[PDB]
Structure formats: C-alpha cells, structure tokens
Curated annotation (Swiss-Prot):
Changing N59H: Reduced proton transfer. This is Carbonic anhydrase 2. Changing A62S: 2-fold decrease in enzyme efficiency, as determined by kcat/KM ratio, and efficiently inhibited by chlorzolamide. Interacts with SLC4A4. Interaction with SLC4A7 regulates SLC4A7 transporter activity. Interacts with SLC26A6 isoform 4 (via C-terminus cytoplasmic domain). PROSITE patterns: ALPHA_CA_1 (PS00162), ALPHA_CA_2 (PS51144). Changing V118 to K/R: Strongly reduced CO(2) hydrase and p-nitrophenyl acetate esterase activities. The active site is at H61. Changing L194F: Normal activity. InterPro entries: CA_dom, CA_dom_sf, Carbonic_anhydrase_a-class, Carbonic_anhydrase_a-class_CS. Zn(2+) binds at H91, H93, H116. Changing V139H: Impaired activity. Changing L194A: Reduced CO(2) hydrase activity. Changing V139 to F/Y: Strongly impaired activity.
Length: 257
C-alpha cells in the first residue's frame, strides 16, 4: 500500500489516488513575498479550553492524538473560516535529520517537523461527510524547529515508547493541546488538500508564521517510532512528509502586514 519509501512514496501515489495531480494539492511552498495581506480575514479563534483528548495511536504513517469530537469542546473559528470547525486529532510529520521534515516550506526553507491540528466543519455533522465537501476541513499547521524543549510536548514524547509499532494505541486523556502553540497566531492561508492518501481536496490550510521550538531529544524520540507492525522488520518512522506541490491557480493570503 502507500508509504514514504522509494517504491510506495509520494511519486507513486497518483497511480491509486489520481487527485495527487489535482488543482489544489498540499503541501505548498509559501513564498512570503508573493503572499498578500488580506484585510477581509476575521480574527482567528483557537478555543481549546474544553478539549478532551482520548487516545494516541501509531497508524503506520504517523501517530495521532485523537479527541472527543461529539460536542463543540475544542474548536477553530474566524480567520478565513465560515462557522465552526471541531478538533478531531493532531499528528506530526518529521525528518531523519533536523534540516528536513516539514511539509509546507517557507521561501523554500524546510523545518525539522510540522504539527497538524485537524478540524472538521460542524455544518456537515461528522468527519466522514466533511471529507466529501470542498470546505469540509481546516488544518492548523505549526512548524517545529530544534532548539529549546517544548514543555507542552513532553507528555506526548513520554508515551511514544508504548506505541512503537503500527496499530498500537494507548490511553491519552487530559492532554492540553494549547501547550503546542506558539505565542503568535499570525498565519498564511490557502485552499488545499490532505497531504496523505486519499489526498482529498477539502482543506482550508492555516499555517502559523511563528515556529515552536522543541529539543533535539524530543525529536529523536519521534524518530525511534516504527512504520512497521510488531514482529516485522524494523523501518524507522522518519521522513513521513510529502514535498511541496504546484501552487497552480491559488493565492496565499497572510493575516498580518
Ligand atoms: C503490498 O506489497 C507492495 C506492493 N505494492 C506496491 O508496491 C504499491 C506501491 C504504490 C502504491 S500507491 N502509492 O499508488 O498507492 C500502492 C502499492
Ligand atoms: C479520509 O481520509 C482518511 C483518513 N485521513 C485523515 O484523516 C487525514 C487527516 C489529515 C491529514 S493532513 N496530513 O493533511 O493533516 C491527512 C489525512
Ligand atoms: Zn499531516
């Protein structure tokens, strides 16, 4: 099936997911000079105070922290969005070395990793119906650079030993995703897609300008995870990022002057 290796990686995905060559694919390079400030964007509202994390899962492509999305407990609104988008999960993409790992790039610069907080538009009732809609999803993307440790990430790092291999899950309640955000909510936004198969073109991307810093030890712990299941030959979970895709007929808007 699909992956990140030579024989099943991004350059192969189009054969089973032809939208891989579509008109609004993600990620993209964010050329900061050609992005345009958009005074029509409303203030962005990240409302995570009632977030209810449930579980962490190694799905063979990344690890997901899942949330209870049966009510409006952790939502994203404002910015480019109409209405309310409910948080369902977050995960990361990262590299084998600190000089790569992000999916979006900024003036071609790659960060060590990228966090994706995935939300679905509540007008569609649940995630599965939302991914049938051109405005079904909003993903908040946050770059990670290696420097000082991020205290609010440590609880994630500490549980990874229990989900080393594909299909493993563990209880992960009472985790506050607000500890993963940078100080500033300045962002760029554009219409795009899921960055993994099935590559559906449902996402309003909101990519924060300010990276968070994580320590070398924190990202090394990400790199000890496995793509494979237990008892299978070990392939380290590293470089699980899709490269930047053609911008095509899209303009990136900035929330800041
Ligand atoms: C199952 O053993 C390996 C044989 N399969 C493959 O090599 C393969 C490669 C690419 C795709 S993809 N990226 O178009 O979906 C799907 C399958
Ligand atoms: C209908 O898809 C089946 C499951 N896939 C997902 O939920 C999914 C969510 C977010 C991203 S990402 N990397 O764009 O944030 C990629 C995939
Ligand atoms: Zn992602």
């Amino acid at each position: 099936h699909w992956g990140y290796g030579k024989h099943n990686g991004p350059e192969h995905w189009h054969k089973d997911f032809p939208i891989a060559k579509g008109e609004r694919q993600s990620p993209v390079d964010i050329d900061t000079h050609t992005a345009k400030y958009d005074p029509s964007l409303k203030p962005l509202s990240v409302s995570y105070d009632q977030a209810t994390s449930l579980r962490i899962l190694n799905n063979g492509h990344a690890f997901n922290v899942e949330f209870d999305d049966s009510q409006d407990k952790a939502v994203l609104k404002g910015g480019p969005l109409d209405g309310t988008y409910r948080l369902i999960q977050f995960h990361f993409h990262w590299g084998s070395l600190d000089g790569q790992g992000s999916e979006h790039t900024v003036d071609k610069k790659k960060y060590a990793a990228e966090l994706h907080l995935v939300h679905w538009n509540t007008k569609y009732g649940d995630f599965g119906k939302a991914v049938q809609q051109p405005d079904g999803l909003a993903v908040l993307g946050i770059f990670l650079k290696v420097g000082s440790a991020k205290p609010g990430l440590q609880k994630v790092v500490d549980v990874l030993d229990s989900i080393k291999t594909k299909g493993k899950s563990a209880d992960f309640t009472n985790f506050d995703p607000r500890g993963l955000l940078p100080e500033s909510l300045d962002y760029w936004t554009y219409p795009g897609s899921l960055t993994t198969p099935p590559l559906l073109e449902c996402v309003t991307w909101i990519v924060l300008k300010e990276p968070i810093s994580v320590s070398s030890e924190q990202v090394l712990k990400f790199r000890k995870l496995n793509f494979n299941g237990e008892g299978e030959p070990e392939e380290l979970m590293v470089d699980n990022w899709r490269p930047a895709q053609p911008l095509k007929n899209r303009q990136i808007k900035a929330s800041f002057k």
